[PDB]
Amino acid sequence: DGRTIQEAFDSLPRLESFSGSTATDKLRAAITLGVSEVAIGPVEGNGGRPYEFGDVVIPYPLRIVGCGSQGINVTKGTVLKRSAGASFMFHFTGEGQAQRPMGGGLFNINLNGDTATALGDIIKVTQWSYFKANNCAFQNMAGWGIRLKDVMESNISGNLFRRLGGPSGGGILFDDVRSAVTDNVNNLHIEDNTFALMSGPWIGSTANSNPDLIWIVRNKFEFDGTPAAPNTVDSYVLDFQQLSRAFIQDNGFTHFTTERNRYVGVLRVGATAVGTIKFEDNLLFACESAGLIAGGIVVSRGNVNNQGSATTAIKQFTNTSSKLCKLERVINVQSNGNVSVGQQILPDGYINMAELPGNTRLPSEYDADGETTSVLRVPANTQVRQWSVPKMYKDGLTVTKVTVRAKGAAAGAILSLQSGSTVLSTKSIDAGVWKNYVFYVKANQLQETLQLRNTGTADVLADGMVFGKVDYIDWDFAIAPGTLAAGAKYTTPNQSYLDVAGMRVQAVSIPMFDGPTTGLQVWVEATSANGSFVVVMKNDTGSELVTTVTRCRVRAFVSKGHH
Amino acid sequence: DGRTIQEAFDSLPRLESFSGSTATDKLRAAITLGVSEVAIGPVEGNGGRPYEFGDVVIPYPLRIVGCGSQGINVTKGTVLKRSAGASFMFHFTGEGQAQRPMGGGLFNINLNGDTATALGDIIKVTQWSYFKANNCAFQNMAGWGIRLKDVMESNISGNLFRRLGGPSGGGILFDDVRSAVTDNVNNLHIEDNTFALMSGPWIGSTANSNPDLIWIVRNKFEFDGTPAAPNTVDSYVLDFQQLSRAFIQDNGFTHFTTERNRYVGVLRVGATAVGTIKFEDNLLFACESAGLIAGGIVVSRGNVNNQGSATTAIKQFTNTSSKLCKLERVINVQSNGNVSVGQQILPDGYINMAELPGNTRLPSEYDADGETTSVLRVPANTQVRQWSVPKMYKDGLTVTKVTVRAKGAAAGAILSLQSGSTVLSTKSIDAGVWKNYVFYVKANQLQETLQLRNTGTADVLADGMVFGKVDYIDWDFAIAPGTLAAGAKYTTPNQSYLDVAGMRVQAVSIPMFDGPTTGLQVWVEATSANGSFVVVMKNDTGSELVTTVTRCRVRAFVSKGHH
Amino acid sequence: DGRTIQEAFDSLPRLESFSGSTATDKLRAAITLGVSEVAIGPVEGNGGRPYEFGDVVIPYPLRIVGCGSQGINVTKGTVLKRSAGASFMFHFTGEGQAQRPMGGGLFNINLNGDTATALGDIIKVTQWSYFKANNCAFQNMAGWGIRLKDVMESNISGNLFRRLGGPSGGGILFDDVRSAVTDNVNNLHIEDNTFALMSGPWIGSTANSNPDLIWIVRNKFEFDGTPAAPNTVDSYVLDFQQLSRAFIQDNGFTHFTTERNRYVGVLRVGATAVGTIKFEDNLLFACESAGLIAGGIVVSRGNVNNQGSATTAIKQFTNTSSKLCKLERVINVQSNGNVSVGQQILPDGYINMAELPGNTRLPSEYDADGETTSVLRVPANTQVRQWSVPKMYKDGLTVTKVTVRAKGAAAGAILSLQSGSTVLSTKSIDAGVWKNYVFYVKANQLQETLQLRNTGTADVLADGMVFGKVDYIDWDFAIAPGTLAAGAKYTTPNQSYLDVAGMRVQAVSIPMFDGPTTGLQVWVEATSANGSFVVVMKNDTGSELVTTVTRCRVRAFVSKGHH
């Protein structure tokens, strides 16, 4: 002893070597002793061969430290191979534990499956928190690299994932929740990683996985080739049947195509997905499709695909989500720098109705002819949406206009534009077609908020709207000029600015009519300084003129007050 | 010796064990020797108990390496407890050092306070650079986790912060500058961290802290519960009384409410804060308010709150900053996917005046009725803002119009629109109310720049403006038709296109007037190809007509040149 | 032996000590043995001096582990100095290797050059993957810190770079590709780093480097001072002669000016650069210029410069790229919070033509007078761009208008607006000047897509366009009133709504003419309910009137259908 102070036999560097019979049977000698960190040394101390573990169960936050690195090659560093017919290599599980396991993981380790085809899992983590897998590899099997169930607060960064998955595998799997829907995968970082040459979902989640607050950022995903096990189904690199808050950002994705192992899209989001998925500022190369969004709130912006050697421009998300999606185009630039798919050219001032606030839950649905393909279904006697009027417009001197693109599901839908419960105007909605419905708000009618409501008896599908100030209002009114003797004239009823615009009328257009006014000399007389007017119609023919018109119309122009 | 080459007693693995009497008195034996790295081994070598340090002072970049992990549990890994009545556990300080300490920190260590209520600091870092605290924990006291004064170039990532703070504590504190305002906290990364169940500011700064270039990104902040010490005051998760360049992005924030330990908002920014704070693309859940911005330039976009179980939609930032803030709505989506707070519906083409360039410092102030609540105060004889005219509009054939929303602080404010020192037109500003002031720029007056100036004698508050091309210009002019005999007519003075629009006039509206024109047949005669015109007013009554009008007006429509 | 189980002499902790003669000659004893990890201990075991390596070649993924930290100071931790006249310290190379090196690097090491002026390289990495350099320093020479050739999948994060470069050095260099253009630098992370007081490019690439998928994020770049070797040429902090997919985001940049060692700009991008460079959300302080973009697709948004003590507002990117660039202003705020350079005020609805899709590669070029300085050159008989018409506009009841800003390179350019191969209308383009060319699409002509084509015989330069719905259409038509006897009148040919607007005409303006209409009383008669009309011109003079006009024009207003 007397090692200048302590004793010798200082197995503080608890390497695998101190334990028992064989590597895997040393197993719980490691674990039974409840040692905190175990060194695993390089492939030199096992004679060029990897240490071979199988079905090792870790019930406590055990650091397995290595002296390898992220990388495919197996000839330098710590290397670990799954055993002949074992289901997993390590199962870090707090199932049955009084206190939940918190910490531990895999540091500096090249982890392989026993064979390039062994279905199963490499590393399972169940009911655990603050697992880290750093500077590692996960490779060489046809099951899942890392399988996660009820794991929180965790980190998987700077690793390689390769030759993983197939028919019933993939990379990192968010499995079903363990018990309650809150026993999910949440607060997990997947960063700085490299994914390559894999089958199944590269990252995925099950139909009951309920994941939340997932970072998938600054990774590199690239096809690379087909592994031992090709895909049996149309596949997506990121396949999340459920997903809540998620950042999927600043990643590369390269060569994901149908012909290349059936990667028909980059991201797929299941119908039952909820929370906000940000798919933003990814740089793609020669990818076939952004993917399929069947559910959730998904925001996609800033993504750019260089088409490279691909035969076609990237296809945009197919969206059938029942929820607001804001899917800005994935820009397609050809390898020569030419844009062949640009930003979506929207109608000026277009707002998809799902982007507006409202007091009723209104599921979105797919319509091929909707501006964004996504439209609200609004049943009878139900608010569409209600929004705040800009403070610059509430000056008593601004006419505004709402144009809404709508389709009746059947006969009898009516849209009303309202200020609160006051009905401003109504439009009957034509069944079965998209049409633009125009509603003007006189300057004296505009208040704090506006709403559209279905006041009819059938469902209306609401696409989007344009709302804003206008500098004129159209006006049509009854006339009855009758039969005029030679030289006789008729003067229309007064058209008060109050009725026309709700505010001073600056001027009007020439008047037009619901029929020919042959032989009528027409002019306008102001009846007040505020732009009220009559139209005068004088028989200029020299003999009796039987007029036919019964309506007159103008465009009335509006500016401010009297100065 | 002759250890196949060297000597034995190879205390190159300098564990705590080689030093002196007790853990803390080993203290400077460690430190006096000036050893670079010290291993601290797991809770097994101290008999299930943590090693207990207090008031240990580190004057040199000392790595304290551990074999623990980020995590709450104290039963596996390196664990360190503050001592009975000690103020701190470690003080990494370069106070008095000839050369500033640069490096060192805390690697793989679960750090606890002696008791869940001990006010003080766990870890203080003063006058230091390139401190790293990685894979750690900071927990179990009512003071500050990490206290920072004059620390630069540093990193605190992948840690847990929990059961910290209260009345006079919090998580990570940016304390006052040490001496000169440049002895601040700058270039610090706070990433990949987990904050939980804490009181005070989770991250904060003092009124004299002057921090700059701070990342707070891809962390998880969640209420979790109330710790031993509840908040005594209304609190904010991020409370920066001073802050310059800062990225606060891609974080989760969950369940921050008044009822939940008085977290009345997520972010608060002090009045004296300066540099650009980016609060962007955070995903919130059941949070009560974005917070209160009392100062600085703050940009907030891309944030989305899922309201979840909260009773109310998230409230938006209250902003009283004297400086430009660009605060895009934090979108509120209900747990069912329904938007109940959408993006702010702005007037079409609205620009808040603080977003424009100008040659004078003009502090912003709060006005409830301003479009963004933030408005400029512009004293007499002072420029409001000046901007560049788009090159597409400077073709000699484009009329433009400025609409500015303004309120006089008192009688006598005047806004002038100018091209350089040339005054284009003026509007007297009404005291005490918001009104829209309209200024037209004839096509022949538009040059390189435009400016608004207060040319009056009182302050004007400037909200925002709309500036853009228009396809018409309103025009009003003097007439004097007088008394007309039967059949007699009056022709107005010529209305030159040069005066009307400054360019060819395409057409005009019907003319209106400052009073009734009963009995007057009115038409327009072109006087040139370029749209100049007179109005003719003919007495169509058959007897003497005494007219009353003295002004005529039209809308004049403009298109391009003559072809 | 019988070390309670194993043998003693357990040189599993392979420190440098076990090898051979001297540090560098231990060289391949380390390497020949093919040891995976080598510890290098602190400056204490070499008597206060750094271990001094030179021209050490590593052909296999060797971890060189240290117990230092990122930092300038050389008195605590592992420190390594280049030798007297050696070209490099380590060359991690897989040149000649059967299997490519994958893994290894530099962990916890302060790496210095022998002298502050030694041109050369500190660390070269050639033909390698998954190199990591973490928690390190790279300092004290006038050559390159890290030189990279054919390195992939790699990471350089959390390091210090200082007193590096000069005339023929810099920080991190992406050197030429090794053999095929795919033997590049790709999938590399440069994060969390600190750059300081350096010359040359801080990060750069050669004219043949072809880099792809580079992160440069959340670093701190600051002038700091001039090193031993000042710049001999105008320099850029980031100088990438070639660069494809790259994220340059969330970085600080501080005090980069011409006077401060000739940093004339922050980023320079070479003419032959391709793939999408995102320069986004950087926070600059007292920087002189964003830089010079001579090539590639570059997207720049969210950047803000606080001018601080600098004398001038930051200058914006100079752009001469042949490819689409979307360069949103770098906002300039003065140290007092006043904006002095705001967002670019664009014409309302402006789209630079390069942002649109098209079937032909059309290189962009510089024009000082272009809205963005970047314009397309479109030769004869070639499409300009083609875009999709918004679905809200394709209702058969919407008139739209294209305004395109264009300059003929020479006489004879013609722009045609077309729906597919159907020509809607044409404009001859004036040589040598920018002009706005207006094209109206009647409501009955609008289909699925629109295109502009050069149908002339010279090149046209295309700046940008405005495309959108309009609520009127201008119309001009032939008349022949001739000589009218007293009281006689002329009625123009019918103006069908079909010809005027392609849809119902709501009203028209007063008619104007190609000359004076003195003495003509003019009115309009509707000829149908759908807004067709004639103009009547009656001689109101009482004697023969010889008219002179031959054209009449109106603005025609359009709304929806008949209800």
Q: Do C75 and B99 touch (CB under 8 A)?
A: yes
- Encoded tokens for B559: 């298109």
Q: Is A74 helix (H, G, I), strand (E, B) or coil?
A: coil
Residue among B310, B158, A207, A68 nearest C192 (CA): B158
CA–CA distance, A80 with A40 (Å, rounded to integer): 9
Q: What is the per-residue DSSP string for A37-87?
A: EEE---GGGGTTSPEEE-SEEE-S--EEE-S--SSS--SSS-EEEE-TT-S
Encoded tokens for C44: 């204490």
Cα C357 from Cα A333, distance rounded (Å): 9
Q: How far apart are CA A472 and CA B510, in angstroms?
A: 14
Return the CATH superfamily for domain B51-341: Single-stranded right-handed beta-helix, Pectin lyase-like (2.160.20.10)
Q: Is B184 exposed, middle or buried (0-12, 13-18, 19+ CB in 10 A)?
A: buried
Distance (Å) from the alpha carbon of C474 to chain B's nearest alpha carbon: 8
Per DSSP, helices labelled H in C269-367 are none
Tell me the DSSP string of A227-282: -SS--SS-EEEEEESS-SSEEEES-EEE---STTTSEEEEEEE-TT--S-EEEES-
Q: Would you state the torsion angle of the CA atoms of residues C366, C370, C372, C373, taken in this order, to the nearest 10 degrees?
A: 20
The kind and range of the H/E element at C498 are: helix C497-500
C34 CB contacts (<8 Å, ≥6 apart)?
A: A44, A76, C60
Rounded Cα–Cα distance for residues B244 and C304 (Å):
12
Encoded amino acid at A177, one letter: V
Contact B367, B480 (CB under 8 A): no
User: Whose structure tokens read 């009303």?
Assistant: A416
**Could you tell me if residue A499 is left (phi over 0), alpha (psi between -120 and 50 degrees) or otherwise beta?**
alpha
The minimal CB distance from A192 to the residues C155, C362, C391 is found for C155
Q: What is the rounded distance in angstroms from the CA atom of residue B429 to the CA atom of residue B439?
A: 13
Instruction: List residues of A with catalytic annotation.
Output: 153, 212, 222, 224
Q: Answer for the pair B183, B203: CB distance below 8 angstroms, yes or no.
A: no
Nearest to B69 among A104, A245, A523 (CB): A104
CA within 13 Å, CB half, A260: 23
- Confirm or reject contact between B506 and chain C (CB < 8 A): yes
Q: B-contacting residues of C 371-390, CB under 8 Å?
A: 371
| Alpha-carbon span B141 to B144, nearest angstrom | 8
Q: Minimal CA–CA distance to C271: which of C229, C312, C320?
A: C320
Retrieve residue A476's tokens. Answer: 């049509």
CA atoms of C331 and C334, how far apart (whole Å) = 10
**Are the Cβ atoms of B519 and A505 closer than 8 angstroms?**
no
Q: What DSSP state is assigned to residue B510?
A: B
Cβ-count burial of A420 within 10 angstroms (0-12 exposed, 13-18 middle, 19+ buried)? exposed
C341 in contact with chain B, both atoms CB, cutoff 8 A: yes
Q: C497: part of which helix (H) or strand (E)?
A: helix C497-500
B153 is catalytic: yes
Burial (CB count within 10 angstroms: exposed 0-12, middle 13-18, buried 19+), residue C421: exposed
Assess C517–B contact: CB distance below 8 Å, yes or no. yes
Query: Cβ(A377)–Cβ(A365) under 8 Å?
Result: yes
Rounded Cα distance between B58 and B73, Å, is 27
Whether A348 contacts chain C with CB within 8 A: yes
Distance CA(C92)–CA(C58), nearest Å, equals 5
Which residues, including other chains, have CB under 8 Å from residue A262's CB and lie 6 or more apart? A230, A231, A233, A234, A235
CA dihedral (C496, C501, C503, C507) in degrees, to 10, reads: -80
H or E, element range at A497: helix A497-500
Contacts of B334 in chain A (CB under 8 A): 361
Q: Which helix (H) or strand (E) holds C29?
A: helix C27-32
Using CA atoms, how far residue A43 sits from A67, A68, C11, in Å, is 10, 9, 15
Contacts of B249 (CB under 8 A, 6+ apart): B216, B217, B218, B278, B279, B280, B281, B282, C250
Residue B29's SS3 state is: helix
Could you tell me the CA-to-CA distances from B304 to A298, A408, B337, B455, C117 in Å, in that order?
11, 32, 12, 43, 52
Task: Copy the structure tokens of residue B516.
Answer: 């009734």
User: Which CATH number is A10-210 given?
Assistant: 2.160.20.10
CB contact under 8 A, C283 and B213: yes
Q: Is A491 on the interface with B (CB under 8 A)?
A: no
First-residue to last-residue Cα distance in chain A: 103
Q: Which tokens sit at B71? A: 């995590």
Under a CB-based contact definition with an 8 Å cutoff, are residues A470 and A515 in contact?
A: no
Token pair, residue B263, equals 């977290």
Upper half-sphere CA count for residue B402 (Cβ side, 13 Å): 29
With beta carbons less than 8 A apart as the criterion, state whether B139 and B163 touch.
Answer: yes
Token pair 């350079």 is found at C341
- Burial profile C228-247: b = 16 or more Cβ within 10 angstroms, e = fewer: bbebeeebbbbbbbbbbbbb
Amino acid present at A408: G
Kindly state whether B245 is in contact with chain A, defined as any CB-CB distance less than 8 angstroms.
no
Please, which residues bridge with residue A279 across strands? A248, A300
CA atoms within 13 A on the CB side of C113: 30
Q: Would you give the DSSP letter of residue A45? A: G
Contact yes or no for A471 and B466 at CB 8 A: no
- In A372-506, the DSSP E strands lie at 374-378, 382-388, 399-408, 414-419, 422-428, 435-441, 449-454, 460-470, 472-478, 483-484, 489-491
To the question of domain C54-341 being in CATH 2.160.20.10, the answer is: yes
**Which residue(s) pair with B401 in the sheet?**
B440, B468
Establish if C322 touches chain A: CB-CB under 8 angstroms. Answer: yes
Tokens 């004339």 locate to C264
Q: How many CA atoms lie within 13 A of B410 on its CB side?
A: 6
Q: Which chains touch C (3 or more CB pairs under 8 A)?
A: A, B
Q: C419 exposed, middle or buried (CB, 10 Å; 0-12, 13-18, 19+)?
A: middle
SS3 state of residue A221: strand
Judge contact between B371 and B346, C-beta under 8 A: yes
Whether the Cβ atoms of residue B453 and residue B424 lie closer than 8 Å to each other: no
The answer, for B559 touching chain C at a CB cutoff of 8 Å, is yes
Residue A562 and residue A504 in contact, taking contact as beta carbons nearer than 8 Å: yes
Task: Judge contact between B183 and B214, C-beta under 8 A.
Answer: no
CATH: 2.40.30.10, 3.30.565.10, 3.40.50.150, 2.60.120.260. Which one for B366-470?
2.60.120.260
Task: State the amino acid at position A237 in one-letter form.
Answer: V
Task: State the Rg of chain A over Cα.
Answer: 35
Q: Could you confirm whether domain A351-470 is CATH 2.60.120.260?
A: yes
Q: Which residue numbers of C are catalytic? A: 153, 212, 222, 224
SS3 label, residue C473: strand
Q: Give the span between the Cα atoms of B306 and A323, in whole angstroms.
A: 13
Handedness of CA C442, C443, C444, C450 (dihedral sign): positive
How far is the C-alpha of C183 from the C-alpha of C204, rounded, in Å? 17
C477, two tokens: 């038509």
- Cα–Cα distances (Å) from B536 to A270, B479, B518, C483, in that order, read 71, 11, 14, 21
Which chains pack against A, by 3+ Cβ pairs within 8 A?
Answer: B, C
**CA quadruple C287, A249, B186, B304: dihedral positive or negative?**
positive
Query: Which residue is associated with the tokens 């504190």?
Result: B173
CB contact (8 A) between residue C13 and residue A13? yes
- Taking the Cβ of residue C515 and every Cβ of chain B, the question of whether any pair is shorter than 8 Å is answered with yes
Rounded Cα distance between A412 and C369, Å, is: 55
Whether residues B474 and A354 touch (CB distance < 8 A) is answered with no
Q: Smallest Cβ distance to C6: which of A17, A333, A369?
A: A17
Q: Confirm or reject contact between C525 and chain A (CB < 8 A).
A: yes
Give the pair of three-digit tokens for residue B107: 């690697």
Residue of C nearest to A19 (CA): C5
Interface check for A553 against chain C (CB to CB < 8 A): the answer is yes
| Burial class, C563, CB count within 10 angstroms (exposed 0-12 / middle 13-18 / buried 19+) | exposed
* C181 interfaces chain A, CB cutoff of 8 Å: no
Pick the CATH number of C375-470 from 2.60.120.260, 3.30.1370.60, 1.10.10.10, 3.30.590.20: 2.60.120.260
Question: B512 and A527: CB-CB below 8 Å?
Answer: no
Beta bridge partners of C172: C146, C203
What HEC string does A22-44 produce?
Answer: CCCCCHHHHHHCCCCEEECCCHH
Which residues on neighbouring strands pair with residue C507, listed in sequence order? C557
Q: What sign does the CA torsion over C102, C104, C105, C107 have?
A: positive
Task: Check if B518 contacts A (Cβ < 8 Å).
Answer: yes
- The rounded distance, in Å, linking the Cα atoms of A357 and B471 is 33
Residue of chain A with shortest Cα separation from B70: A103
- The nearest alpha carbon in chain C to B250 belongs to C250
Instruction: Find the distance separating the first CA and the last CA of chain B, reported in whole Å.
Output: 103
| Cβ–Cβ < 8 Å for B99, B33 | no
Residue A491 and residue B540 in contact, taking contact as beta carbons nearer than 8 Å: no
How far apart (Å, rounded) are the C-alpha atoms in residues C304 and C307?
A: 9
CB contact, 8 Å: C397 with chain A?
A: yes
- How many secondary structure helices (H) and strands (E) does chain A include? 2, 51
> What span, in angstroms and rounded, lies between the C-alpha atoms of B368 and B345?
16
* Chain B partners within 8 Å of C15 (Cβ): 12
DSSP B45: G
Tokens for A166? 């197939």
* Closest CA in chain A for residue C12: A41
Provide the strand spans (E) within C342-448: 351-352, 364-366, 374-378, 382-388, 399-408, 414-419, 422-428, 435-441
Give the nearest chain C residue to B157 (CA atoms): C192
Sign of CA dihedral B66, B72, B75, B79: positive
Chain-chain contact of C130 with A69 (C-beta, under 8 angstroms): yes
Question: In Å, what is the CA distance from C363 to each residue of A217, A260, A310, A433?
Answer: 33, 32, 21, 42
**Chain A residue closest to B373 (CA)?**
A391
Parallel/antiparallel/unpaired status of strands C351-352 and C460-470: antiparallel
φ, ψ of residue A424 to 5 degrees: the values are: -90, -50
Distance CA C366, CA C357 (A): 20
Q: Distance between CA atoms of B132 and A382, rounded to whole angstroms?
A: 57
- CB-based burial label for B116 (10 Å; 0-12, 13-18, 19+): middle
Which member of B99, B469, B525 has the closest CB to residue C517? Answer: B525
Place of tokens 């590269």: A202
CA pair distance C427, C420, nearest whole angstrom? 17
* Phi-psi group of B353: left, alpha or beta (phi > 0 → left; psi -120 to 50 → alpha; rest → beta): alpha
- Inform me whether the C-beta atom of residue A557 falls under 8 Å from chain B C-beta atoms: yes
Exposed, middle or buried, B491 (CB in 10 Å: 0-12/13-18/19+)?
Answer: middle
Contact C327, C296 (CB under 8 A): no
CB atoms under 10 Å from CB of A108, counted, come to 25
Compare CB distances from A18 to C5, C62, C130 and report the shortest one's residue.
Answer: C5
State the residue for tokens 């050893």.
Answer: B35
Q: Which 44-73 residues of chain C touch chain A by CB within 8 A?
A: 60-63, 65
| Residue A388 buriedness (CB in 10 A; 0-12 / 13-18 / 19+) | middle
Nearest Cα residue to C406 out of C430, C379, C382: C430
Surface of A (411-440) touching C: CB under 8 A: 434-436, 438
> CB of B387 within 8 A of CB of B356?
yes
List beta partners, residue B304: B283, B331
Residues 6+ apart with CB under 8 A from B338: A358, A360, A361, A362
Q: Give residue limits of the domains in chain B.
A: 51-341, 366-470, 472-557
What span, in angstroms and rounded, lies between the C-alpha atoms of C22 and C211? 38
CB contacts of C510 in chain B (<8 Å) are: 507-510, 523-524, 554
Helix (H) or strand (E) holding B30: helix B27-32
Q: How far apart are CA A253 and CA B534, in angstroms?
A: 68
Distances (CA, A) of B508 to A508, C276, C279, C556: 10, 50, 49, 11
Alpha-carbon distance values, B407 to B373, B412, B467, C471 (Å): 13, 11, 18, 33
CB contact under 8 A, C68 and B12: no
Residue C323, classified by CB atoms within 10 Å of its CB into exposed (0-12), middle (13-18) or buried (19+), is buried
Residues 6+ apart with CB under 8 A from A311: none
Nearest to C228 by CA among C357, C114, C375, C347: C114
Residues found in chain B? 563
Cα C200 → chain centroid: 22
Q: Tell me which chains share at least 3 CB pairs under 8 Å with chain B.
A: A, C
Q: Report the half-sphere exposure of B281 (CA within 13 A, side-chain side).
A: 23
Residue among C103, C508, C510 minimizing CB distance to A73: C103
DSSP letters, C62-73, are -EEE-S--SSS-
DSSP code for C353: G
Distance separating alpha carbons of residues C406 and C105, to the nearest angstrom: 55
* Residues with Cβ within 8 Å of residue C254, at least 6 apart in sequence: B213, C220, C221, C222, C223, C284, C285, C286, C287
Contact criterion met (CB < 8 Å) for A531 and B512: yes
